[PDB]
């Protein structure tokens, strides 16, 4: 409507005039007005006019908040306490009390750090529970903990809605965005919520991120309740950690109603589903066991046909093709030809025994010591090979007890907080063998059954390793493989001060800098922590060029999720160890076009390291383009390195803490050959 | 009708180095290729063997003579490039396809053949030529370049298009009411991606109706774009 | 003229009197506009007057020969043009140059269509760039068939009327000398057939009645022969 009948009624500041024209503004403030409000010059003057005051306050809120400001646009709100689904509520509540309250939540909010913001906050949580925007409202009001009371306000009727869009969304941007503090009201709030609702498996990812065992409990006498199990048992078993599982079968093992939680929690039922189904419902062929074990030679392709031949991917042929392929095999070949018919038997707990009690005392060292190894790779619930290996490792100095004490110790660790081997690992830590595998798979090994403490720990096999390695600076391996021992002790936190703690304690010369480093790298599992970006690129140009390699191998850990920030020009540089950087973060995903498309830059180099470290991990992130790379690298060759490797691909080309951890051990292949003695026991295996 | 004719094409290109043992030891090697040419052409036999030979091997795509007759006539330097990056690309398949004033044509063809004969070189890549007419081609070209096998494509009309939809539609979904008379009455020159590409346009039609069942009409809606497609070019 | 002007404000107008603010907070661009029926009036009148108090410039594909080569050596022939449109921001361009050949023919420009509408609606490097379909055939069905209307304009094109002929006879009688005893209704409303051509074809094919009867203005009766010479053909 024209301005000539209601343009001077503002104007004049009688008290029955307001309480008149104001219910009339009122009324027109249904639609605002017919423009954008350009009477402001006019009736700016009624800021300090009142007798209706609260409409007063309310066509001043209307037409501030209408045109333009940033403070006083709810201050009016703010003292008003609103009074007096139609488009006057939608127009004034939806979007002018949408960005009213944004900016008063982000002034107030982020201001001082009263009762007039939660009320009225309350009031706007009505408001928008009647207009009912989902995805929009919560998302403005994240940062107003009042997110705790507000999702179990919300979280009634809307499960779906708030749920599948706000926890998805606002996970995903709760890892990315959002600082831990409040994702620790996610993880409880949704512990409540998601306690009450449906649908459990979410909350089991809220153990996975939690590690509680009141949530797991809770998730197995009510998805008891709720009857199928062996789906559930795998992915049980497969989203615990460490931690979880030996409390989850101490609470299980306490009173678990049944005796199937007890029968869950162990290395059978995820596992009994998989196995037999996986035999009956696909099949492998021989192909690659009869024909990658059929083209061996050079005493490498017997390393690399070991290896593939201790994959499990029913076949049994090569392994049972007569004898002394073993004896013909190296030392390394012989630990992990000795460990195939452990790899081999993931499952068949009782033929565990039968098959390796063959190399059992045995005349070779390695056979028998790799047949320990094997009864540690066999299974993970058992724990009866504990005596029988651990008896007679007391020697320490040359005996085959320390080989045995390799596969024993490591093997063990993978049949794992456990404090009595390592009481028993005390004089192996502080046994300062020349050796670098008896401290390194004793390191890795406390480390990897330690994988996931509360916050870490400082206990005195990591801290005896320190003061230890505080006393000879010598055997840079020691200086590489003993802060995987550190840092893996350190697995579990989240906001741990403990990377500065050693920062302060055991820091020195380049070395136990590059330990220092080594921490830092398993202190950045991932938060709002952009100081480690701005940091990041701070240290890109650093002249050590190894804590470069580490701390920016953390690459493809820190910004696991936000794919599209991983993609950079980290390949058009000179320093081919970057290229390395780049050829790490790339990972064991589904491997897009993009991957590869990274992998045929980085497959064509001079170098053996990166030209042998291009087929490991383009065949751990590929799972009719599989055996053409290997045409590939049959039109690259035509070493021996590149060819154990391209076997291993050949083989390999068709938050998880087991199965990404034992990956930093084949990080370090730059070495003599006895990489593979330690490379054949890897963990990460489906 | 293209078992035997596909195991002799895969006994043919298929008994070097991707599974050799039987190629080295006798002492016949003929390392010069097939030359692919089809009745109907356009892509039937001609990716119907691009698509079947890549189970293991390395493809090497040359399609189309445009950008020889769309600019002056810069002749057997793209051939030269083709040759380096074939020479640093050893253990690949040449596959040249889609060959179609003539007093250039007749000495780039020369040089063509001369050049792709292997002059310089020995036997050691498999070369494979494809046209639509090989009556068009000199017969000029058939002695030095063709000298281990050509392949003629036999086709029963009924059973090539039915037995090779009957394999392709057995593992997929499709409509009702799939005429074939029409089919296999009133095309030519066309593959086996063209009657995917109509019944995948046919069910896809249907399904931006957000339907499972197509109608003949809009079968034949569909076929009149086979109908146009041989008579445009 | 005011049905197409008052619709045509919004297409090409609305980034007139708006800001770069309006690129952030408001409605980014208009993709794109077609209007149906055969071109006999306002083909060029639309566009070239709207442009004419733009002061743009008119870049036009028109994929066939001589065309080809000027806009770059080789390419898919929307990214040159797109160069093109990156040095020069105003640029209105017209969509200009069966079901059997047309299907084909005519859908090399609906694919060309099809990509500079996804390239519009792909990413905005500049602004004032705008296409026009024009298809008054089968292939505006076929078309229909492969528009995807979620990206289009929807403006009524009368030539298949009348009133597209009485303002654009107006029009065209505003230029010469007419008499006071006509009545455009039914001169004007009672021609139908081709397009709205025919009413040109009126006027210059009247003008040969006019000076062969020696008037000095045109008459009605003049317009009613000249409207048999148009129903002649076509």
């Given at each position: 409507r024209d301005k000539a009948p209601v343009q001077p009624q503002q104007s004049p500041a009688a008290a029955p005039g307001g309480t008149d024209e104001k219910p009339s503004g009122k009324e027109r403030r249904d639609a605002g007005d017919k423009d954008k409000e350009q009477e402001l010059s006019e009736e700016d003057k009624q800021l300090q006019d009142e007798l209706y005051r609260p409409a007063l306050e309310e066509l001043r809120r209307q037409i501030r908040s209408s045109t333009t400001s940033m403070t006083s646009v709810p201050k009016p709100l703010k003292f008003l306490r609103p009074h007096y689904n139609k488009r006057f509520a939608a127009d004034i509540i939806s979007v002018l009390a949408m960005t009213m309250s944004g900016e008063r939540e982000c002034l107030k909010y982020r201001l001082v750090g009263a009762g007039e913001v939660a009320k009225e906050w309350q009031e706007l949580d009505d408001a928008e529970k009647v207009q009912r925007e989902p995805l929009l409202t919560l998302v403005k009001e994240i940062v107003p903990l009042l997110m705790e009371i507000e999702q179990v306000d919300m979280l009634e009727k809307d499960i779906d809605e708030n749920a599948y869009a706000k926890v998805c969304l606002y996970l995903t941007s709760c890892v990315n965005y959002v600082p831990e503090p409040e994702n620790s009201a996610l993880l409880r709030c949704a512990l409540g919520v998601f306690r009450k609702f449906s649908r459990f498996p979410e909350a089991l990812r809220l153990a996975l991120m939690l590690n509680d065992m009141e949530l797991v409990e809770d998730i197995f006498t009510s998805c008891k309740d709720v009857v199928m199990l062996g789906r559930h048992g795998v992915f049980l078993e497969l989203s615990e950690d460490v931690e979880e599982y030996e409390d989850l079968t101490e609470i299980m093992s306490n009173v678990q109603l049944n005796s199937n939680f007890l029968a869950l929690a162990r290395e059978l039922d995820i596992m009994e589903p998989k196995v037999p189904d996986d035999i009956y419902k696909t099949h492998l062929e021989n192909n690659r066991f009869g024909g990658s074990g059929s083209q061996v030679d050079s005493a490498r392709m017997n390393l690399a046909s070991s290896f593939v031949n201790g994959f499990v991917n029913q076949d049994k042929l090569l392994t049972d093709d007569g004898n002394k392929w073993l004896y013909k095999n190296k030392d390394h070949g012989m630990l992990?030809?000795?460990?195939?018919?452990?790899?081999?038997?993931?499952?068949?707990?009782?033929?565990?025994?039968?098959?390796?009690?063959?190399?059992?005392?045995?005349?070779?060292?390695?056979?028998?010591?790799?047949?320990?190894?094997?009864?540690?790779?066999?299974?993970?619930?058992?724990?009866?090979?504990?005596?029988?290996?651990?008896?007679?490792?007391?020697?320490?100095?040359?005996?085959?007890?320390?080989?045995?004490?390799?596969?024993?110790?490591?093997?063990?660790?993978?049949?794992?907080?456990?404090?009595?081997?390592?009481?028993?690992?005390?004089?192996?830590?502080?046994?300062?063998?020349?050796?670098m595998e008896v401290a390194g798979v004793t390191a890795l090994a406390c480390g990897m059954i330690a994988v996931g403490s509360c916050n870490g720990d400082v206990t005195s096999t990591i801290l005896q390793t320190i003061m230890e390695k505080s006393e000879t600076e010598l055997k840079d391996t020691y200086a590489r493989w003993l802060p995987l021992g550190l840092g893996l002790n350190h697995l579990g936190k989240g906001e741990a001060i403990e990377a500065i703690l050693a920062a302060l304690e055991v820091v020195s010369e380049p070395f136990r800098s590059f330990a220092n480093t080594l921490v830092d790298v398993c202190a950045y599992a991932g938060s709002g922590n952009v100081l480690k970006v701005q940091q990041l690129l701070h240290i890109c140009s650093?002249?050590?060029?190894?804590?470069?390699?580490?701390?920016?191998?953390?690459?493809?850990?820190?910004?696991?999720?936000?794919?599209?920030?991983?993609?950079?020009?980290?390949?058009?540089?000179?320093?081919?160890?970057?290229?390395?950087?780049?050829?790490?973060?790339?990972?064991?995903?589904?491997?897009?076009?993009?991957?590869?498309?990274?992998?045929?830059?980085?497959?064509?180099?001079?170098?053996?390291?990166?030209?042998?470290?291009?087929?490991?991990?383009?065949?751990?992130?590929?799972?009719?383009?599989?055996?053409?790379?290997?045409?590939?690298?049959?039109?690259?060759?035509?070493?021996?390195?590149?060819?154990?490797?391209?076997?291993?691909?050949?083989?390999?080309?068709?938050?998880?803490?087991?199965?990404?951890?034992?990956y930093h051990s084949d990080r370090q292949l730059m070495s003599q050959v006895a990489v593979a003695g330690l490379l054949t026991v890897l963990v990460s295996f489906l | 009708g293209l078992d035997n004719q596909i195991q002799e094409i895969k006994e043919s290109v298929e008994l070097p180095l991707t599974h050799p043992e039987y190629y080295e030891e006798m002492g016949i090697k003929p390392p010069k290729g097939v030359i692919l040419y089809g009745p109907p052409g356009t892509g039937k036999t001609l990716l119907a063997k691009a698509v079947a030979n890549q189970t293991s091997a390395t493809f090497l795509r040359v399609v189309g003579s445009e950008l020889i007759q769309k600019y002056l006539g810069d002749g057997p330097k793209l051939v030269r490039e083709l040759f380096r990056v074939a020479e640093e690309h050893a253990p690949s398949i040449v596959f040249i396809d889609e060959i179609d004033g003539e007093?250039?044509?007749?000495?780039?063809?020369?040089?063509?053949?001369?050049?792709?004969?292997?002059?310089?070189?020995?036997?050691?890549?498999?070369?494979?030529?494809?046209?639509?007419?090989?009556?068009?081609?000199?017969?000029?070209?058939?002695?030095?370049?063709?000298?281990?096998?050509?392949?003629?494509?036999?086709?029963?009309?009924?059973?090539?298009?039915?037995?090779?939809?009957?394999?392709?539609?057995?593992?997929?979904?499709?409509?009702?009411?799939?005429?074939?008379?029409?089919?296999?009455?009133?095309?030519?020159?066309?593959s086996g991606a063209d009657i995917k590409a109509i019944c995948t346009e046919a069910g896809l039609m249907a399904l931006r109706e957000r339907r499972m069942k197509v109608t003949n009409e809009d079968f034949k809606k569909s076929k009149e774009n086979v109908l146009y497609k041989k008579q445009e070019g | 003229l005011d049905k197409q002007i008052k619709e045509i404000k919004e297409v090409i107008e609305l980034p007139v009197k708006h800001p770069e603010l309006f690129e952030a907070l408001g409605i980014a661009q208009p993709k794109g506009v077609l209007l149906y029926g055969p071109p006999g009036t306002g083909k060029t009148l639309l566009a070239r007057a709207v442009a004419h108090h733009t002061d743009c410039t008119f870049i036009r594909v028109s994929?066939?020969?001589?065309?080809?080569?000027?806009?770059?050596?080789?390419?898919?022939?929307?990214?040159?043009?797109?160069?093109?449109?990156?040095?020069?921001?105003?640029?209105?361009?017209?969509?200009?140059?069966?079901?059997?050949?047309?299907?084909?023919?005519?859908?090399?420009?609906?694919?060309?269509?099809?990509?500079?509408?996804?390239?519009?609606?792909?990413?905005?490097?500049?602004?004032?760039?705008?296409?026009?379909?024009?298809?008054?055939?089968?292939?505006?069905?076929?078309?229909?068939?492969?528009?995807?209307?979620?990206?289009?304009?929807?403006?009524?094109?009368?030539?298949?009327?009348?009133?597209?002929?009485?303002?654009?006879?107006?029009?065209?009688?505003?230029?010469?000398?007419?008499?006071?005893?006509?009545?455009?209704?039914?001169?004007?409303?009672?021609?139908?057939?081709?397009?709205?051509?025919?009413?040109?074809?009126?006027?210059?094919?009247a003008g040969m009645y006019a000076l062969r009867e020696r008037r000095v203005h045109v008459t009605q009766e003049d317009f009613e022969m000249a409207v048999a010479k148009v129903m002649q053909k076509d």
């Open positions: 992990s030809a000795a460990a195939s018919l452990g790899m081999i038997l993931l499952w068949d707990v009782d033929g565990g025994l039968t098959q390796i009690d063959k190399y059992l005392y045995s005349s070779e060292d390695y056979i028998k010591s790799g047949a320990l190894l094997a009864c540690g790779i066999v299974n993970s619930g058992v724990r009866n090979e504990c005596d029988p290996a651990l008896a007679l490792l007391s020697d320490y100095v040359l005996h085959n007890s320390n080989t045995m004490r390799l596969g024993s110790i490591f093997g063990l660790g993978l049949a794992y907080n456990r404090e009595d081997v390592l009481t028993l690992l005390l004089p192996v830590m502080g046994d300062s063998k020349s050796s650093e002249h050590f060029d190894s804590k470069e390699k580490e701390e920016d191998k953390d690459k493809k850990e820190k910004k696991d999720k936000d794919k599209k920030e991983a993609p950079a020009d980290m390949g058009a540089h000179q320093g081919v160890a970057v290229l390395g950087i780049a050829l790490i973060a790339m990972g064991e995903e589904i491997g897009a076009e993009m991957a590869l498309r990274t992998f045929g830059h980085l497959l064509r180099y001079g170098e053996p390291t990166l030209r042998r470290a291009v087929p490991l991990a383009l065949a751990l992130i590929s799972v009719s383009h599989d055996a053409d790379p290997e045409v590939s690298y049959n039109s690259i060759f035509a070493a021996r390195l590149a060819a154990m490797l391209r076997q291993l691909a050949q083989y390999h080309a068709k938050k998880g803490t087991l199965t990404l951890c034992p | 007093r250039e044509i007749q000495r780039t063809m020369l040089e063509l053949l001369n050049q792709l004969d292997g002059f310089d070189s020995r036997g050691d890549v498999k070369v494979i030529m494809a046209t639509n007419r090989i009556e068009t081609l000199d017969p000029a070209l058939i002695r030095p370049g063709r000298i281990d096998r050509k392949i003629e494509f036999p086709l029963p009309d009924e059973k090539t298009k039915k037995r090779i939809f009957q394999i392709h539609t057995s593992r997929m979904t499709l409509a009702d009411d799939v005429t074939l008379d029409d089919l296999i009455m009133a095309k030519d020159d066309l | 994929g066939s020969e001589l065309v080809q080569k000027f806009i770059g050596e080789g390419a898919r022939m929307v990214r040159e043009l797109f160069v093109m449109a990156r040095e020069h921001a105003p640029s209105i361009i017209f969509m200009d140059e069966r079901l059997e050949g047309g299907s084909g023919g005519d859908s090399e420009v609906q694919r060309t269509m099809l990509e500079l509408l996804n390239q519009l609606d792909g990413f905005e490097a500049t602004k004032n760039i705008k296409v026009i379909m024009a298809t008054n055939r089968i292939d505006i069905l076929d078309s229909a068939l492969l528009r995807p209307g979620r990206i289009d304009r929807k403006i009524e094109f009368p030539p298949p009327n009348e009133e597209a002929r009485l303002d654009i006879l107006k029009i065209h009688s505003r230029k010469m000398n007419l008499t006071r005893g006509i009545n455009l209704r039914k001169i004007a409303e009672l021609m139908p057939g081709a397009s709205g051509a025919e009413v040109k074809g009126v006027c210059t094919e």
